[PDB]
């Protein structure tokens, strides 16, 4: 009835489709090979599986996601793994030359091998489907199979299903520490594209998931499979409602229809409540008021962007739990009245309350068995720090003309460049007379 | 490579599209890869590191062929002369 | 012992000519073979030759091995840069060296002599065995004179 | 299957390609009888990236040996882990082109380039998608250049798109063997630049101080100095033959370390590097790698590379480690050596990482790095130019093989126009 | 957590520095093949304040061996716990010192101090919370004096805010093992007045004194000496290695025992010292601890502390002991002997003990005392100092080597402005 379509494209896309799978796996009791056990069962029924999780007959059940990538080995080690059987095999899409940290080879010259293929099968995903409920795409800003072949791939899900919802799982490259030198080219690149094309950017920064491992899960020493899997959380917490019941459930379209103000404006903030770590999480009180105050804490905040430099717009919380609602009426009420946190004039409400019946899965491993969860969803101004520090990079890379060889003689033009500067500068632009006061 | 669990077990073959070498497989043509892979792996353990003569007799009326000796076999027919291939 | 004038006068010009038979029937393409071992005394080296008859195949293939020592515990590992060198240094001053007394890390190597190789043994040079079949009015002198066995019968190959 | 084509042409390649081909083959444990007898999974998935197989386990080795002389020819096959190399692999020669570019270019050598790019192809054909080409090449000698450059650009002709990393050691005045480096190197250059796109320049002088003040060599013999540099290329390859994160392979590293077109010539570096006598007293951790891939001792060649602030610097780790460290350590190394880096190129270190450790160790890091410093690699060999060209020596043996001073002249000019960008950019 | 950086210096340096690692080894229980086998979880809880980790458990102390001839090296790894020492810190050298002061810090000294100070910026680099170091020289003869000064006035120059412990073997009037004692102590000191925060006088004719009045030795080798000297050596630096309440650590002594900037000399003395006739005879607590403590027969220092009112004193217990036995005894002491206390200081005695005693006693304790007494050993190097100097006597080598006939006498004024403040002080 209410499925959902993910689309993981570029490596960090895979990673973090490997964590989300495989918490999927342990959320419901779909196992590894692909049957769901004889002599064992978890909760809801018969039907909560029909969201990501696919029904074939004799009950070998499949997931409905496809995992795109330009390059093997990484694409090879998720299907060789733990999860052989679970995945159809025809879903992974592999390439055969590496995408090459590069626009270009992402978007204009290998774009045309695979992406036939790659919308053949979302045809056949969506034959499949009696209510297509929405596109997540799970992509890194970085890399060239993570920007060109996701911002490819947008144009034609724009043309194809226009009508349907589509959102960003998105890894920013991070403004402080970063891994590779064309990220800010590449970023660029691939949001002018992806700008017109994507209804909601949920965004995710390692620099913060590495300081939130450091603070909170007392790991000094975190890993991808660490990150991913705290990005995996966030990204089954997001889609829950679907999955399960509770007292308010929220739709993928309550999602856009309640967290992007202006059509442009579209880049919100995930975060976690309780990232707690098991030998100091029985220890808490873990209330709801807390955790309320834990989301807006200027710390837990999944990207490296200052909240209190700017004003909040619509701020979705999704429980997960035992949540009585009514704590959570008394939180926001708390929340309304500390000056930290700033709204703009023209929201007077802006808090989505959801509330899903069900507390978190854990994974064996890290985070903790706590019967309570929220994620916070916040449209801020502060993303404009983020933009500000990045179109800083690209300016001062492009002045002297820095890799710019690699783009333009392999399918790319010059010009591609700067009108994508120029949507950055229309976008730092609107970012600030949307959050100017009313003086009219 | 060989990680087909080893032994005679089922699991043997490498999901399609495995860009990874199944050591001594592309020299071999015929099946489908998952059957395949099974083979191609079973090829490295072996070392890793006239048909009528038995009661199929009769050799069928006509049998484009030379059953040595038939040049100089007067006798009953095709079936009862070609009731030993291999005398 | 780390000096080379004891060795290099002792046994200057004096090599150790080995007949051997590789055997490669259970190749599978391929075939026995006809190794010459050159074993030099003078600096602990064994060399090992090839010969072909006419009309061959296989090319005029150089020597089969060259001059250097023999790894005697089957095909060992290249190790990392620095660990099966000479003896071990503590530090350089400030073209220097200090001669550290407590040698410890690689310097267990195991490698062929005179008395690992004798007539009727199998040797495993760098993987494949051979089996040496026959040797030398030299060699029989010497092994005479050193080890005192005469059973010089040979195992005649193929 | 990305597969990768090596070039082995001259009597210092042929060398540091026999030890190079050893690492490979001691990782994808190939024993010097051909059959694989190694025992992990990882090895033999992508065995297409070295090792072509054939009937019988006997993964010979993608190789094109060239020599003008059949010596290193014999020296290779008789070696070790050299009785694996194909048989019609081994292109020979009757002759020897005596140290001169002339000879080994336009002479007996190019008499011969077809007799090797004829077996090139058949590797080509035997392909799947053959990542690039990687050269063992001496600029300096004979052979090994002018054999080399010549298949270099005519290998590019055939297939332009394609990557061409030539790990080529270049001569650092201190120590010299034939007396017409100057001359024979300076050539190269010329043909490098416009054919080139990785030059991953090694120096016997730097591996030498490499083999004396980090290992702690009393007699470092070649073959060390061979192995330093072989573990470098094994190393650069590393994602396009193991699992792990960061997958960045021999195009990525192109496509972050390569600003103009022209401004690739960059130098290498091998982390894990300690004495026989020290290595239970080593913490192998990531920080201690850091320290020593990004100092003057560790690079594989002789320029301080502290005399330039370098434009592009990335890593390949290996082995089971937390990115957060690789990433802290980095970061903190620009914020730390901030005098060491261009400020027009943001973010200016790559770091790769794979989920195999090389045999015997548990971390590793190979560097390549565009030092601005290199300037001074090739000056010296322009330096050292005039003295010869001056009095027009040494240039007798070398005109009257079919050569004129006007290449000379080119070739300076282009050694100029080489170390002309580089003090341009040397203040961003 | 807090790190101690260890450098020795000179042959009385060395050796000293090598009997206070192997009792430090034997107390947190490390074989010389630098492996853990103990018998308390506690005994490795705090050990990295003076072992650096490696792989495997091979912890490694963090100490910088140096001396200007590689005999004290040779000797210092042919003792018994050899196989614990860092190669790459064992910074040797090839010379002669000559017992030169020149010769130890004008001369190779000072080209080979480049070195030091790169493995001991390593070393202090690799740290968490650096606290401090620990340079084990003697006062006089030479490397010790020479290299050992300007090496504390680099460590001083690039951390300024850390303790900096110099564990100094001054010189003895009634026997002389060099002619130029005088020359070597007067130009030391000059430097140690004004950089480090405290150090730590030996002399060597109350170690004789020790060992035959009190621990009843026969022959008393420099083994026995230097082991006495390494107890107290480890008893001053307790509280940061094991647990305890009054746990005090280096700079709580610091500010304990500094009353005023520039007098910071200190006499110590460990108490448990049995004669192996006496000791089953003996009834070991506190009260007879104290006694032992504050006599003038376990001053390590030939400097009698009834000839100087005592500024302050710090003892440092170790061992499960009760407070007020401690305490009571600590103000008894000072009601006991108040004309050798002073008055403008009340209450001048530090108090904190460690849980755990060293191996085989019950108890033991480290005396610090900061005496008025330290004016007779000052001034009369001051006087044997200007007997030689009258004459120009053995001078010749310090003013050929680039230094002259004035920069002694500054030295000579700073013994003099020293003697004047301990003897103002004790004089109110
Ligand atoms: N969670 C997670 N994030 C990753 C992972 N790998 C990479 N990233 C992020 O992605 C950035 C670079 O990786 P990518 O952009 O995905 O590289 P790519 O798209 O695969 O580029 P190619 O090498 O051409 O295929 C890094 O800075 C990380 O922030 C991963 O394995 N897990
Ligand atoms: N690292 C290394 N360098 C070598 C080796 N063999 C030769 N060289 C260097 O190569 C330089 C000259 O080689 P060259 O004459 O160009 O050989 P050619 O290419 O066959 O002519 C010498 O200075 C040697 O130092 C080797 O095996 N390893
Ligand atoms: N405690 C102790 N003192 C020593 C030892 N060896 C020498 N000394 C003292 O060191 C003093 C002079 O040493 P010095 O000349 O400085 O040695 P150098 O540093 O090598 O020049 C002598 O008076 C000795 O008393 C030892 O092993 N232990």
């Given at each position: 009835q209410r499925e959902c379509i993910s689309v993981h494209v570029g490596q960090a896309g895979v990673q973090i489709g490997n964590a989300c799978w495989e918490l999927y796996c342990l959320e419901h009791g779909i196992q590894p090979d692909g049957q769901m056990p004889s002599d064992k069962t978890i909760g809801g029924g018969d039907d909560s599986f029909n969201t990501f999780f696919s029904e074939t007959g004799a009950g070998k059940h499949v997931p409905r996601a496809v995992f795109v990538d330009l390059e093997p080995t990484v694409i090879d080690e998720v299907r060789t793994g733990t999860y052989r059987q679970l995945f159809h095999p025809e879903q992974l899409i592999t390439g055969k030359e590496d995408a090459a940290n590069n626009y270009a080879r992402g978007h204009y010259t290998i774009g045309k091998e695979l992406i036939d293929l790659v919308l053949d099968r979302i045809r056949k995903l969506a034959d499949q489907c009696t209510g297509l409920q929405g596109f997540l795409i799970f992509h890194s800003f970085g890399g060239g199979t993570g920007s060109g072949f996701t911002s490819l791939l947008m144009e034609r899900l724009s043309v194809d299903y226009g009508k349907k919802s589509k959102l960003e799982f998105s890894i920013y490259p991070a403004p402080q520490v970063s891994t590779a030198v064309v990220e800010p080219y590449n970023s660029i690149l691939t949001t002018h594209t992806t700008l017109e094309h994507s209804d909601c950017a949920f965004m995710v920064d390692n620099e913060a998931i590495y300081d939130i491992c450091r603070r909170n899960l007392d790991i000094e020493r975190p890993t991808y499979t660490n990150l991913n899997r705290l990005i995996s959380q966030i990204v089954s917490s997001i889609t829950a409602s679907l999955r399960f019941d509770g007292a308010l459930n929220v739709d993928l379209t309550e999602f856009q229809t309640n967290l992007v103000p202006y059509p442009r404006i579209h880049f919100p903030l995930a975060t976690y409540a309780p990232v707690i770590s098991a030998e100091k999480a029985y220890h808490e009180q873990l209330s709801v008021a807390e955790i309320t105050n834990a989301c807006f804490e200027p710390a837990n905040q999944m990207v490296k962007c200052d909240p209190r430099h700017g004003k909040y717009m619509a701020c979705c919380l999704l429980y997960r739990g035992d949540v009585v609602p009514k704590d959570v009426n008394a939180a926001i009420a708390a929340i309304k009245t500390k000056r930290s946190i700033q709204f703009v004039d023209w929201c007077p409400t802006g808090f989505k309350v959801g509330i899903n019946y069900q507390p978190p899965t854990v994974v064996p491993g890290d985070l903790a068995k706590v019967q309570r969860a929220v994620c916070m969803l916040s449209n801020t101004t502060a993303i404009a720090e983020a933009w500000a520090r990045l179109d800083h990079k690209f300016d001062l890379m492009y002045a002297k003309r820095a890799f710019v060889h690699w783009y333009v003689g392999e399918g790319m033009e010059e010009g591609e460049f700067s009108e994508a500067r120029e949507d950055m500068a229309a976008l730092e632009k609107d970012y600030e007379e949307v959050g100017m006061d009313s003086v009219e | 490579?060989?990680?087909?669990?080893?032994?005679?077990?089922?699991?043997?073959?490498?999901?399609?599209?495995?860009?990874?070498?199944?050591?001594?497989?592309?020299?071999?043509?015929?099946?489908?890869?998952?059957?395949?892979?099974?083979?191609?792996?079973?090829?490295?353990?072996?070392?890793?590191?006239?048909?009528?003569?038995?009661?199929?007799?009769?050799?069928?009326?006509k049998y484009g062929g030379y059953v040595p000796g038939y040049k100089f076999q007067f006798g009953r027919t095709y079936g009862h002369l070609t009731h030993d291939a291999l005398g | 012992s780390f000096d080379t004038l004891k060795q290099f006068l002792e046994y200057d010009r004096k090599v150790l000519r080995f007949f051997c038979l590789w055997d490669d029937s259970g190749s599978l393409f391929g075939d026995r073979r006809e190794l010459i071992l050159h074993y030099f005394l003078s600096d602990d080296t064994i060399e090992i030759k090839e010969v072909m008859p006419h009309n061959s195949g296989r090319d005029a293939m150089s020597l089969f091995l060259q001059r250097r020592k023999l790894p005697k515990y089957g095909p060992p590992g290249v190790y990392q840069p620095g660990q099966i060198a000479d003896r071990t240094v503590l530090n350089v001053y400030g073209y220097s060296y200090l001669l550290d007394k407590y040698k410890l890390g690689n310097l267990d190597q195991e490698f062929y002599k005179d008395s690992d190789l004798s007539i009727g043994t199998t040797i495993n040079v760098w993987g494949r065995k051979v089996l040496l079949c026959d040797c030398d009015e030299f060699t029989k002198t010497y092994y005479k004179t050193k080890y005192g066995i005469e059973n010089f019968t040979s195992i005649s190959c193929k | 299957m990305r597969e990768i084509v090596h070039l082995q042409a001259g009597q210092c390649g042929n060398q540091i390609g026999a030890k190079f081909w050893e690492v490979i083959s001691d990782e994808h444990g190939i024993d010097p009888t051909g059959t694989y007898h190694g025992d992990s999974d990882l090895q033999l998935e992508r065995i297409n990236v070295y090792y072509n197989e054939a009937t019988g386990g006997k993964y010979v080795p993608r190789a094109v040996l060239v020599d003008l002389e059949p010596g290193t020819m014999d020296s290779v096959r008789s070696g070790p882990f050299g009785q694996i190399f194909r048989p019609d692999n081994f292109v020979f020669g009757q002759s020897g082109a005596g140290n001169n570019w002339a000879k080994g270019h336009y002479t007996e050598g190019a008499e011969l380039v077809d007799s090797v790019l004829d077996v090139v192809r058949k590797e080509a054909e035997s392909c799947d998608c053959l990542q690039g080409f990687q050269l063992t090449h001496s600029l300096g000698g004979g052979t090994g250049s002018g054999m080399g450059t010549l298949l270099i650009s005519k290998i590019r002709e055939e297939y332009p798109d394609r990557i061409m990393n030539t790990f080529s050691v270049v001569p650092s005045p201190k120590v010299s063997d034939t007396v017409v480096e100057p001359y024979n190197a300076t050539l190269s250059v010329h043909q490098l630049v416009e054919n080139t796109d990785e030059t991953y320049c090694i120096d016997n002088e730097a591996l030498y101080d490499i083999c004396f003040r980090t290992l702690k060599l009393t007699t470092p013999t070649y073959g060390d100095l061979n192995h330093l540099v072989s573990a470098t290329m094994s190393g650069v390859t590393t994602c396009l033959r193991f699992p792990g994160q960061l997958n960045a392979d021999l195009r990525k590293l192109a496509v972050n370390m390569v600003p103009f077109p022209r401004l690739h010539f960059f130098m290498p570096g091998f982390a894990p590097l300690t004495s026989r006598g020290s290595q239970q007293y080593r913490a192998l951790t990531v920080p201690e790698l850091t320290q020593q891939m990004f100092d003057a001792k560790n690079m594989m060649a002789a320029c301080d590379p502290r005399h330039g602030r370098y434009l592009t610097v990335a890593a390949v780790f290996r082995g089971r480690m937390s990115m957060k460290e690789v990433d802290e350590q980095m970061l903190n190394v620009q914020n730390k050596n901030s005098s060491y880096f261009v400020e027009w190129i943001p973010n200016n270190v790559k770091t790769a990482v794979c989920d195999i450790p090389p045999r015997g160790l548990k971390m590793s890091a190979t560097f390549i790095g565009n030092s601005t410093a290199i300037q001074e690699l090739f000056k010296r060999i322009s330096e050292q130019f005039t003295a010869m060209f001056r009095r027009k020596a040494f240039l007798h043996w070398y005109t009257g093989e079919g050569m004129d001073e006007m290449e000379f002249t080119e070739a300076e000019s282009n050694m100029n126009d080489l170390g002309n960008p580089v003090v341009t950019r040397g203040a961003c």
């Open positions: - | 490579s060989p990680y087909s669990m080893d032994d005679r077990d089922p699991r043997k073959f490498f999901m399609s599209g495995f860009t990874g070498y199944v050591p001594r497989a592309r020299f071999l043509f015929g099946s489908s890869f998952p059957v395949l892979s099974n083979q191609a792996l079973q090829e490295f353990d072996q070392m890793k590191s006239s048909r009528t003569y038995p009661h199929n007799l009769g050799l069928l009326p | - | -």
